[PDB]
C-alpha cells in the first residue's frame, strides 16, 4: 500500500478506506469519526474548486494574455452591475451550499427534485452525488476517484503557487514559468530572498496596496507579506 | 521516576505527576489544597493561553514594524489604534469587559458547579458547554477539530505542549516588559541589536540591569 | 498551607488586614475628594 | 582482547567490542542508551566520510590549483568557468532539493531498517543493506565488501576519524595563518622555529563579514584571536 513515506506506520484512524488515503494525518486531525467526515466533504470542494479554478487561470492566460488573473476583478467590465452580478451569485450559492449541507448533515434527505417530482437522486454517498451529476462515467469508480482527488491535491498547491507567483512577481503563471526557464538559477524564491541573523532582504510585494474600483479604494495587500522570507 | 525541576529532591505528595507540565514545582506549597491546586491549574492555564496569544500578537506586530509595513510597536499600538480610529476608549473597555464578564462568569460557575452550563439555559446548547476536565473545556465549540475527543495518548501530548508553550510564553511578556523598560525599544530591536554584536549588547551592558557595570 | 490559613484566620491577623482596608479605603477617599465636611 | 584506548582502562559494558574500532573509550557514557549508540555511530560514519571526502577535496584542490585559497573558494567570483559569479540562490536550491532526498532516505532507513531498500521508480533496484550505514549495491558496484568486511569498516572508521581531526587542523590552521594546509607545512618547514602555534595563534586571519553579492555572512574564528 502506497504511503506518504516508505517505511512509516500510517495512523490508526486511517485504514485505507477513504479514496486518497496515504496514512499522512501527522497533527491527528482526523481521528474523530465525525471530524473526518467534515474534512472529507471539505477536502473534495476544495478540490474541485481549485482545480476548475487553476483551468480557468491558465485559460484565461492563454486566451486573454494582456488581462492578469490577479486584476480580472477589476478590468472586467459588464453590462450587468457588480452589485447585481454578486446578489445573483450570492443566492444561487446560498441554494446550492444550503442543499450540499443538508445532504452532508441528513445522508438521503435532498436527492429529491423540489419543482419536478419525477426526478430524484439514486442513493449514494456524501461527497459523490452521482444521477443527473454524473452522466458519464468512464472506467472504474475507486480509479477515478482516487485519480480526482490526487489531482485535486496538486491544484490545491497549484492555486497557492499562482497567488504567491503573482503576488512576488506580479505576472501570471504561464509567464512566471517563461521568466524562470529563460534564467533558472535566477529566477527561484531562494534566488530572490534570503534571511541571516544580520540581514533580512525580502522581494517587494508586486501588487498595489490599493485599487481604484468606481470610487470605493479596496484594499489588496499581499498574503502575510511581513513573514515573507 | 519523572524529571523534576531540580534534580535530586523528591517532588512534593501534591503533585504527583498527573497533571500537564507536572515537575514538582512547589517550593511555597501554595497549591497543596486540592481545590486551592484545581484552582490554580486554571488559572495557570488562562495565564498560559493569554501569554500565548500577546507573544504570538506582538512578535508579530514586531516583524511588520521591523520591515517597511507601518507598523506599531507594542507599547504604542494601543494609543495609535484608539487615534487613528474614530474609537472611544471607555466605551472599549466596557464593551470587552461585558464581554469577558459573561464567559469569565461562566467558566468561575462552571469552576464551581461542573456540567451546569449545559442545562441548555443560554440559548438552548447544552454539550457546547459541559466541559471535559478542568481548564480543559472541550466540545464542538472550543475544539471544533475534536482532538480532545479522539487518540487519548495524543490528548496528553498536546496538553503537555500547551503547559509547556503557556509557561515559554508568559516567560517572554516578562522579558518584553523588562526589555522595553530597561532598553526603551522595540523585542525585536533588542534582538537586531544583541545578533549585531552579541560580546557588547546585551543586559550586562545595557547600563540598568547591572549598576555597578 | 492550611495551618498557614488557619493562622491568617487568627483575631490579630485578621484585625490587621482588616483595619489596614479600612484606612486605606478612608485615605483614598480623602484623597480623590479633599476636605469632605458637608454632603 | 583488543586494545583498549589506554594502559588500564576498564572498556564499559556496553562497549564489548562489537562494532569496528571500538577501543572502550566513553568518558560521558553518551553510549549507555542503545538507540542513543546507534544514532550516534550513524552520526560519526556521516562525519567520518564528511571529512575524509573534505580533507581530499582540501589537498587535491591545493595541488591542482595553488592560487585559490579553500578558505575563500566558497564566494562566488573564486568559482571556476563557467559557475563564476553564478547565483548562489540557485546553487542553494539544487543542492538544498537533492541533499533533502537522500538525508530523508538515510534517515527514514534509520528509522525502519530495511523499508527503502528498494528503487521508488524502476521496481526491482534494490540495495542488500546488512548494517545501518552500510547500504552497499549500487553504493558499492566494485564489490568490495565481498570479504572481510570487519576489517575494512576498521579501517573506514580509523581513516575516518583521523581526516576528522585534520580537517579541523585544516580549518584552525587556516584561520591562524591564512593559507591552505601544504602553504603551512611548507611555511613551517622554511623556519620550525619562527613559524609554529607559538606566534601564529592569537591572530584571526578571518574577517567580521563578507559581503557575498548582496547580502552579508558574518564569519568568525574559532578562538577570540585578533582580527
Not at chain 1, 202 to 209: E, N, R
Not at chain 2, 50 to 57: I, S, T
Request: charged share 20%.
Amino acid at each position: 500500500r502506497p504511503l506518504w513515506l516508505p517505511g512509516s506506520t500510517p495512523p490508526a484512524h486511517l485504514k485505507g478506506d477513504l479514496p486518497g488515503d496515504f496514512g499522512f494525518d501527522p497533527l491527528g486531525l482526523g481521528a474523530n469519526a465525525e471530524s473526518l467526515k467534515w474534512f472529507k466533504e471539505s477536502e473534495l470542494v476544495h478540490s474541485r474548486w481549485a482545480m476548475a479554478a487553476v483551468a480557468g487561470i491558465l485559460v484565461q492566460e492563454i486566451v486573454r494574455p494582456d488581462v492578469f488573473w490577479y486584476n480580472a476583478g477589476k478590468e472586467v467590465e459588464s453590462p450587468l452591475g457588480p452589485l447585481g452580478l454578486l446578489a445573483v451569485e450570492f443566492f444561487l450559492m446560498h441554494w446550492v451550499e444550503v442543499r450540499r449541507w443538508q445532504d452532508l448533515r441528513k445522508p438521503g434527505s435532498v436527492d429529491q427534485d423540489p419543482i419536478f417530482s419525477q426526478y430524484k437522486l439514486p442513493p449514494h454517498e456524501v461527497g459523490y452525488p452521482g444521477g443527473v451529476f454524473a452522466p458519464f462515467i468512464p472506467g472504474d469508480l475507486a480509479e477515478l476517484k482516487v485519480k480526482e482527488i490526487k489531482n485535486g491535491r496538486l491544484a490545491m498547491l497549484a492555486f497557492v503557487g499562482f497567488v504567491m507567483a503573482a503576488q512576488v512577481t506580479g505576472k501570471g503563471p504561464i509567464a512566471a514559468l517563461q521568466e524562470h526557464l529563460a534564467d533558472p538559477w535566477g529566477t527561484t524564491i531562494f534566488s530572490k530572498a534570503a534571511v541571516v541573523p544580520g540581514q533580512a532582504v525580502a522581494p517587494p510585494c508586486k501588487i498595489p496596496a490599493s485599487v481604484s474600483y468606481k470610487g470605493i479604494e479596496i484594499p489588496t495587500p499581499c498574503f502575510l507579506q511581513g513573514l515573507w522570507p | 521516576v519523572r524529571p523534576v525541576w531540580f534534580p535530586g529532591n523528591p517532588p512534593p505528595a501534591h503533585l504527583d505527576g498527573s497533571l500537564a507540565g507536572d515537575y514538582g514545582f512547589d517550593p511555597l506549597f501554595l497549591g497543596q489544597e486540592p481545590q486551592t491546586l484545581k484552582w490554580y491549574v486554571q488559572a495557570e492555564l488562562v495565564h498560559g493561553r493569554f501569554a500565548m496569544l500577546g507573544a504570538a500578537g506582538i512578535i508579530l506586530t514586531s516583524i511588520g514594524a521591523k520591515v517597511g509595513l507601518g507598523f506599531p510597536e507594542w507599547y504604542d499600538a494601543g494609543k495609535v489604534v484608539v487615534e487613528k480610529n474614530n474609537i472611544d476608549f471607555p466605551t472599549l473597555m466596557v464593551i470587552q469587559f461585558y464581554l469577558m464578564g459573561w464567559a469569565e462568569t461562566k467558566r468561575w460557575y462552571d469552576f464551581k458547579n461542573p456540567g451546569s452550563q449545559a442545562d441548555g439555559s443560554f440559548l438552548g446548547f447544552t454539550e457546547e458547554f459541559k466541559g471535559l476536565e478542568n481548564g480543559y473545556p472541550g466540545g464542538r465549540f472550543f475544539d471544533p477539530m475534536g482532538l480532545s475527543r479522539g487518540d487519548a495518548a495524543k490528548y496528553q501530548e498536546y496538553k503537555q505542549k500547551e503547559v509547556k508553550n503557556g509557561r515559554l510564553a508568559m516567560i517572554a511578556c516578562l522579558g518584553f516588559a523588562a526589555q522595553y523598560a530597561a532598553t526603551g525599544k522595540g523585542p525585536l530591536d533588542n534582538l537586531a541589536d544583541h545578533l549585531a554584536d552579541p560580546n557588547h549588547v546585551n543586559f550586562a551592558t545595557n547600563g540598568v540591569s547591572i549598576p555597578i557595570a | 498551607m492550611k495551618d498557614f490559613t488557619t493562622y491568617l484566620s487568627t483575631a490579630p491577623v485578621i484585625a490587621t488586614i482588616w483595619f489596614t482596608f479600612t484606612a486605606g479605603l478612608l485615605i483614598e477617599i480623602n484623597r480623590y475628594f479633599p476636605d469632605p465636611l458637608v454632603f | 582482547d583488543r586494545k583498549l584506548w589506554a594502559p588500564g582502562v576498564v572498556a564499559p559494558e556496553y562497549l564489548k567490542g562489537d562494532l569496528a574500532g571500538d577501543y572502550g573509550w566513553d568518558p560521558l557514557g553518551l553510549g549507555a542508551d542503545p538507540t542513543a549508540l546507534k544514532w550516534y555511530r550513524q552520526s560519526e560514519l556521516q562525519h567520518a566520510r564528511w571529512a575524509m571526502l573534505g580533507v581530499a577535496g582540501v589537498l587535491v584542490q591545493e595541488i591542482v590549483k595553488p592560487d585559490v585559497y579553500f578558505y575563500e573558494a566558497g564566494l562566488p567570483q573564486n568559482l571556476p568557468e563557467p559557475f563564476t559569479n553564478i547565483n548562489m540562490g540557485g546553487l542553494l536550491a539544487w543542492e538544498f532539493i537533492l541533499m533533502h532526498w537522500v538525508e530523508v532516505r538515510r534517515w527514514q532507513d534509520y528509522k525502519n531498517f530495511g523499508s527503502v531498500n528498494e528503487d521508488p521508480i524502476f521496481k526491482g533496484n534494490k540495495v542488500p543493506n546488512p548494517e545501518m550505514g552500510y547500504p552497499g549495491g549500487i553504493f558499492d558496484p566494485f564489490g568490495f565488501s565481498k570479504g572481510n568486511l570487519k576489517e575494512l569498516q576498521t579501517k573506514e572508521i580509523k581513516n575516518g576519524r583521523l581526516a576528522m581531526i585534520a580537517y579541523m587542523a585544516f580549518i584552525l590552521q587556516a584561520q591562524a595563518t591564512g593559507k591552505g594546509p601544504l602553504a603551512a607545512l611548507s611555511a613551517h618547514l622554511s623556519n620550525p622555529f619562527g613559524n609554529n602555534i607559538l606566534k601564529n595563534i592569537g591572530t584571526c586571519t578571518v574577517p567580521h563579514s563578507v559581503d557575498v553579492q548582496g547580502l552579508t555572512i558574518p564569519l568568525t574564528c574559532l578562538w577570540p584571536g585578533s582580527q
